[PDB]
Structure 1
Amino acid sequence: MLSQIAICIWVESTAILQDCQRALSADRYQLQVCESGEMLLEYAQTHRDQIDCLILVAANPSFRAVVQQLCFEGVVVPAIVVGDRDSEDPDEPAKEQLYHSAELHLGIHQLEQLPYQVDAALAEFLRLAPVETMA
């Protein structure tokens, strides 16, 4: 069976870290918070497979750079992204370069679907896995 799910989130804000993990509180969740983005690389650099879902916040400036390394080393996981506009405006349609095509998106005030999203992110990533992580 499945023992637990490994989720590595990267967020420098406790509220975001708490709301992102709060939803992901299932008894089978292993949330790992990364104080930085480089720290997340070391964690994903030695257990990509052990990671079941990565949480990322686009609100960060060099966040994409940190994600590029995950894709750079080939670390691809059902990564849920936070921070997406809710307008169909073509100026900011939310590009999918934050991570790979398997990454899922989560509204900033929608912190709660992470658990259900994780299950969707896992299935969405497995079907697409291996995903295209050209960063």
Structure 2
Amino acid sequence: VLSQIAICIWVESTAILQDCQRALSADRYQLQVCESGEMLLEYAQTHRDQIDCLILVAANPSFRAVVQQLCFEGVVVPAIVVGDRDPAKEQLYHSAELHLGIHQLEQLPYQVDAALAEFLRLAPVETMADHIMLMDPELSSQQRDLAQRLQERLGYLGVYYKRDPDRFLRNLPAYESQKLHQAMQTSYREIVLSYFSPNSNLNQSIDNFVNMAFFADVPVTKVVEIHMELMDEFAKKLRVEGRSEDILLDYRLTLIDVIAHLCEMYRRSIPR
């Protein structure tokens, strides 16, 4: 039920090629091996509508110059850059490229998924050779045409619960925003106070908090900040009683627990 994926690999090392072939051995992957920069440039130009993902080894001879020509000839497709010469510290081709170490190639089926999805997320992507300042390029929206073509093969329609955007924490008036924040703090306090207590109603308290976090579409950083606010409050409570302020670091478990619950709710929300 999945589309075949056309992979074009520019590789000049036997060991790397073997790792790639092994990882992408399934019938789903159709591999084109390009064994020189010239071959790649020629193949890419003649097959620009037949490449779903490029895999490029950064250590290849004249890598930069080849990537520049790729950009110059308007070939912008989902990509993984393998290793480093030119694991890579910076972006070399476009803003959606993935970086993978030469010893991590067994991951390729998952990372190819990631490179495709990231390209679809960001299209039209920013080229590294082309753009150097802040925000074909007009007609390089052949990118949006590629993305549409890919999304018809690699995307599916599903039903999601319609959360009310007007009730998202970031869209509320600062007053109702303050009110929700305070309610989330009260709920979080209840989790903390109950966390290491036996037979407390901890799961219910976590669910309650997480329902607010999910339905108000709060970012994870906001949960961390609520946690940090309560640790502040608790650190003061402990210091005005004699108790040590090191029991507080056990509540990192609480924070882990809460974010994990939020994560699962998102994970559970994906249709099929």
TM-score in terms of structure 1 length: 0.84
Unpaired stretches in structure 1, ≥5 consecutive residues: 86-91
Q: Which has the higher contact order (CA 8 A, sep 6+)?
A: 1
CA deviation profile, 1:104-133 (whole Å, cap 9, x unmatched): 111111111111100010000111122122
* Larger Cα-atom Rg: 2
Asked whether 1:27 is paired with 2:23, we answer no
CA deviation profile, 1:17-63 (whole Å, cap 9, x unmatched): 11123212221111111110111111110222210110111112411
Q: Work out which of the residue numbers 113, 118, 127 in structure 1 matches 2:121.
A: 127
CA distance in 1, matches of 2:2, 2:50: 12
- CA RMSD across the alignment: 2.1
Q: Report if the CA contact (8 A) 1:80-1:114 is conserved.
A: no
Q: Percent identity?
A: 98
CA distance in 2, matches of 1:52, 1:126: 11
Q: Report if the CA contact (8 A) 2:51-2:77 is conserved.
A: yes
Q: Which of the two has greater strand per residue?
A: 1
Q: Which of the two has greater helix per residue?
A: 2
Q: Mark the CA change 1:59 to 1:131 in structure 2 (over 3 Å): closer, same or farther.
A: same
CA distance in 2, matches of 1:82, 1:68: 17
Bigger Cα displacement from structure 2, 52-61 vs 114-123: 52-61
Q: Work out which of the residue numbers 94, 113, 120 in structure 2 matches 1:100.
A: 94
Q: Report if the CA contact (8 A) 1:101-1:132 is conserved.
A: yes
Q: Report if the CA contact (8 A) 1:84-1:106 is conserved.
A: no
CA distance in 2, matches of 1:82, 1:15: 13
Q: Mark the CA change 1:115 to 1:93 in structure 2 (over 3 Å): closer, same or farther.
A: closer
1:2: how far off?
A: 4.7
**Which 4+ runs in 1 deviate beyond 4 A?**
none
Unpaired stretches in structure 2, ≥5 consecutive residues: 128-272
